[model samples]
Target: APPVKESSFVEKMKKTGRNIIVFYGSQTGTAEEFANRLSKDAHRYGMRGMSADPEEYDLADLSSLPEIDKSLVVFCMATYGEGDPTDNAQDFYDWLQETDVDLTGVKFAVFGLGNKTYEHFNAMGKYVDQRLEQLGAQRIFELGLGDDDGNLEEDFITWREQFWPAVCEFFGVEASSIRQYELVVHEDMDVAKVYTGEMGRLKSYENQKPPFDAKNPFLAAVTANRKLNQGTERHLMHLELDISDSKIRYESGDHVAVYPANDSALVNQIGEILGADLDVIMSLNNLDEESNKKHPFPCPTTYRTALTYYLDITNPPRTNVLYELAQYASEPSEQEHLHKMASSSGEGKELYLSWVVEARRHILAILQDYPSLRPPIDHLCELLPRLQARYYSIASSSKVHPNSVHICAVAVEYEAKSGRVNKGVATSWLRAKEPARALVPMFVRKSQFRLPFKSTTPVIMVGPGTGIAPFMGFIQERAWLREQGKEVGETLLYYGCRRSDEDYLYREELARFHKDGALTQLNVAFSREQAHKVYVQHLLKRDREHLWKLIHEGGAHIYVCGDARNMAKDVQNTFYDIVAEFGPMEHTQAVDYVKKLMTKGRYSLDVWS
Candidate 1:
């Protein structure tokens, strides 16, 4: 009989005779994916490696690092909202801050995944580096920070290239293999069609788990898909998914991650580019079982399923994808062009950024731009990233309906520089399927965006445009709690929209909530109703004394969501302004006060790009 395969990282590493351990903290799959990538490639540098999730194990094991264990430790972390660690890393991070662990024999390297758009970019990763060194761990390499807003993949590849050689020499090993671009080929193995991409606990028992998660999504029918905006160019969809039969339960302030497929029209265009026979029955399998970039979608499917239900065909082509496909470029100049654009040499990187990332030029558009590159279907499947789930801040409370989940989504559409109409992948799909009675693949993600646990505490919310999604959950929850005669305390809501008549979502419902005493004050900013642009921040400042009393005197919990770019920043500044003017404090004092609020869990933000 063959040796039994182990699922635990520690057991798998032991069985495989692995030495190196890659610990990763990820919100999205990218950081986790990259950790697996490094672990898989560790063999090239004369090492066996395994990737571990920091949250999965007793992190107190970090205190027992020997010289051998020291050289094997590598941390890859992604920072979430504000300076907070990802949900999975929170416990480990909290432990690190409190532990007096002597990491003297521990040698480590760190990599950070972040978006430069946020102020606390790579804050978690940097903190790990500082904390490790302060805890007496020897730093083998300078930290690497990858910005998602820029050429993140290229930044990682470059750092990884330099780090591997250092790691090899430090560990007294000679490199055996050179790294280069190689397209992974998926072969058809006569396996049965059993995969349905249903994520759940592994089981062969008579019973099933209650929670169906991201891996296995529940097919929920859209009970309500009403258009919130009638006259505005921007379309807002209020989706109510009926999950009553799925036995899926969710709390208020959770996010429902909706898994959407690629548009058929776009999928056909991708099929044309890949030179695929659309009708061919195909299955995607990794070149090797231990490969990191495995087939993500359900296999034993047709080319249509592989293209439509699998790949993110319309997403802006990352430079990494360009780099992977460069060798296959028919024209020598085109290959060079791809390499130069994808490389960290900084030659024409900005040009490609504008042409590709900024302009949202997808794989099909890139193919048209090049006009010479033609790759195999399997290779294309291997290269492109999977279609990730779109998370919407749940607008309804479980107190309202445990099985039914609601979301507010602004369908973003614009014209590209190539004069082609571009729409957001998930939003477009949702809008198209609004009347089709299709089931959306979905799972609920638990969030830290909660109302104060103490029902008597005051709550202040700053949400503008579609940012008001999660606050809707807060409002609904407060209303329902009040319905039970629970004291939900005073609620101050500062909300913004372009126009009241054109796009005021949940308008009547909010008034109803207000009448119910769930909302103590409702501050609305109609940005385009007047000659001057009035926003949520301006409205917040107008009621500065009210905010000061709630936040400073009453010690209220605060929340800010939506538009991380301008709106989130403006609101934070507003907080600083309120502190300065009312508290009669210095600018830095006001800053510390806000930070104090964050540290005390009195401030919670749900902003996203």
Candidate 2:
């Protein structure tokens, strides 16, 4: 396809009086949501705005954008897996770098979404901003960088406040009155009709992607689940979900969203503590018009559906939330106690960290401690964000297991210092599944993490804990290629776990791959087996000579999957060290060389919290 000239589209739209184009690069849909919100607000400000996914739009069109007066490009991009663009944004990023397209006269602003813990931070958003400037695109405002690690909503609010005026000025549009949208209020609503449901069979709603997603999840059945880790403090489960009936199909690197069922036992306990009947259904509405409850993202479902299947009600309460909740205590003594819990930083951190870190504490524990507090259903609905799905890398290749997909998950269960038991929503759900409860609802999220089309290209996989999940798929694909008598290149796998017997998932399967020549090398690191920790990064250093060979001679692809905070960072630094020791290059050059490989799509990652 010829490079798109921006003027063709802009001129065509200008005839209709719309001059603003919003491009979004979202991983988990945050950027897209932001773009939509911005577009709606922009319309009231007398500028017509349209939003498009970067993948669906052509950048060649951007070259001719300067011809259109008062043209603006708003970028809402999220950085994925260590300074990389989101899956949908990868093509656009690649096109901007791999192609020479002049972007003169293009006025642009960027808002990048990222977590601060990773070294790369908002590299995707930052890179795009810089690249556009280098190509002579004018900046209408300072780029906005948002961190999910801290207060994401607050960061977004601050950025939007600063950027909107600049945007209005650039388009020569007067700002409209900022009257917020009002929340719906229904009086005399019946509560009994809302809460009615049975254990054996509830009404099966059609499993479709709602207009707003993640907030309102389609409830699917629990299929096959079996315990993988035995006689250990932690629990691990291998779950097989049937999503064949849904419109979802998965590629190797895609993620599966599991909408967990609420813990019924805890739900009942909280009701009892609050002196409310479990069977009593409560009709609710937003007290404030502009509150999130009015148009919850990931919705098109009702409040009841959100509580039962969507929100993570058991998650640790945020400090501010707890402080607000404390204000409603009926008793003076009870109010003081609740206030103390929220006011003491040490106590609040201890309470929140215990519940949020590994396993989440049930709401019953909080209710048990404060029997005098009776929270309105409306408040509960407003406080919690929808329960997000736990993303796992698909562990089996579609080519090898055409009818089935595999996942490796560790069950999360731990005792908090408060002597309360905490459980992970998705992990526990998988572990609790039985074969009798067949059929699981799922949708595949496509990703940029994949091997090259040619089977002859060598690859290195570093996966620790459940991070080994996607590498399993990669190896399986290679094995299938080898079996089909197709030429395949060397495959190296670096896997780590706490112990060989207790937690080494797919141990025998990995050995078989090594023996059959599907894997060129299998390096195992067991941290708990030795006094000092031996991780995947250590193994990468030990095999420096072969690693250098794969990169320099074989043109190998390197992939990392697992924890975003630690493992991913360590692996990156390890690569730099290997290059520094083996290759005769300066430190900066070594770093830039690795980046070049990534920009060229040789180094990739699939990771999540």
Candidate 3:
């Protein structure tokens, strides 16, 4: 028999003779994956380690780490919204903020995962890193920040490369090669009991439950699916999902996260590449029977289900995956290249960035390149990440479309450097959905990006490209209010596109809104129509005086929704410059004033990279 694994992480650490524990505060699985990868790295330094969710264990046990000889605690914290900790890390954060536990002799390291596009980038990571130090914990390494806007993998690889030597030097240990779940091919598993595609609790999708969220989503039928744009280069899909029968409800400013399945052709290609039976029932189980994680994803299912609905087979394989694949290659040249791509060395990192990262090569593509490499299907599945849901702002108001949720999304299609045409997972899935036939698994996420309660207050909105989605809902709601004889005061919308004829989204609708007095002003910026490229911000700058009058004199609420990397920042800066010019304030003063607007709920942003 084997020893029973302790339920508490502290006791488990002692029982398993593990010295390092990596805790991840993850929203998506990226932070968790990184935590596992870090834990696995501990073996190279001759230390046993485990990755954990902060929610699972009594975090008070963090103080007990000093008792374990040569122990280290690593925190991989990801900031979610408004400088806040992730849902799973909320309890840990709360406890950390108030705890008096003296963590003297506790050695730790911190890595923050965030998008630099957000104002409060890596706030949670910073909080955890600083808080640990304040509690008397020894900082083993400088805090590492990985930006999602850039190559997060590259950032992590660079940080991790520096991190290992620091660990090695501190522990007086030399680096060595080392390394989970055993694959069980079931002969006769119950067909009815197996998880097909259901997430969270078992039989959840089949039975149907209340309070649907990220984990438990209602399968809404597609009511309408059509192209908004006439352009052949790209597509903007107008999708309306029926949710009348379900308890699911959404406000105009809310977002809907859609779970997308991998393309059947891609899934089939993977099976063909691996030469595995796609219909065979298989389960990945822990060698230690006491371990709770029976499988990586919802299992006791076939290879097709896992590939189609669960695994993220489309995105570029992480460096860690490449490292694992390197071992299976028989050809020396192929093997070396794989190693270089996965390696943390300067040359390795460069080659990885240009070859794999820049090329956007997925597992299938990687395998295709390396003909000699044939890792087992189960092993590949074990290493692969779970498929994540894609979020889009609800594009229609509940007042206008009471029973349906609308989304205006651009179908992502691009040719990578590898010459393979890449399609967005969610958008392509959405585009393929047959209206009234396809049941889309979706959930509504509440957001603070909302209109003011007072209809008399002036509202200024800046939206470009697909950023126009939420603003469409706002306009629809305002128009509804106007129809009801409500005073919908000064609604100013600044919209931008490439050209009026090509990608002008909701042209007729916006014009009709303006004609009916629902929209006070509709400023359009057609970037490529003239020689001088004009964006929404450029139009904003042109109408600075009017904006100032609305904002300062009329008490207007300003909202910006678009590309966070450039547009949001540009719009914000434009506001600052406007404030500086009109208010007769310094640049710094204008900046603070704008920040004050943000705090006062006068300015809001709902943006993405």
Q: Find the candidate with the highest lDDT and give its number.
A: 3
* TM agreement with the true structure for every prediction: 0.86, 0.70, 0.95
What C-alpha lDDT do the candidate models reach, one value each?
0.78, 0.69, 0.88
Predicted structure with the largest TM-score when compared to the true one = 3
Q: Which ten residues in a row have the lowest lDDT in candidate 3?
A: 1-10
- Runs off by more than 4 Å, candidate 1: 1-21, 36-71, 87-106, 116-119, 134-136, 168-209, 286-297, 435-437, 486-488, 515-518
What is the lDDT for 410 in model 2?
83
**Candidate 2 lDDT by residue in tens digits, 329-381:** 78887666556543324654444445333334345566566667677544555
What TM-score would you give candidate 3 relative to the actual structure? 0.95
* Model 3: per-residue Cα lDDT over 1-609, one tens digit each: 022323678788898888999999997889999999998888877888889888877777878888898889999999986788998898889999889899899999999999888889999999999998999999999999999987899889889989989988998988822326888788878887788888877788878878787888888899899888867668988999998877877888899998899999999988998898988898888765645777889878888999998999988888888887888899989888887776656787787888787988888888898898888788888889999999999998998887899999999889998779888899999999998568999999888889999988999999999899999999999999989988878999999999898898999999999998889999999999999999998989999999999999999999988788888888999999999999989999999999999989999988886
Task: List candidate 3 stretches off by more than 4 Å.
Answer: 1-7, 173-179
* Between candidates 2 and 3, the TM-score winner: 3
Which residue pairs collide in model 3, if any? none
List the candidate numbers ranked by lDDT, top first.
3, 1, 2
- Candidate 2: the clashing residue pairs are 4-60, 4-61, 5-61, 6-61, 212-298, 212-299, 213-298, 235-411
Provide the lowest-lDDT 10-residue window in model 2: 195-204
Q: How close is candidate 2 to the true structure, as a TM-score?
A: 0.70
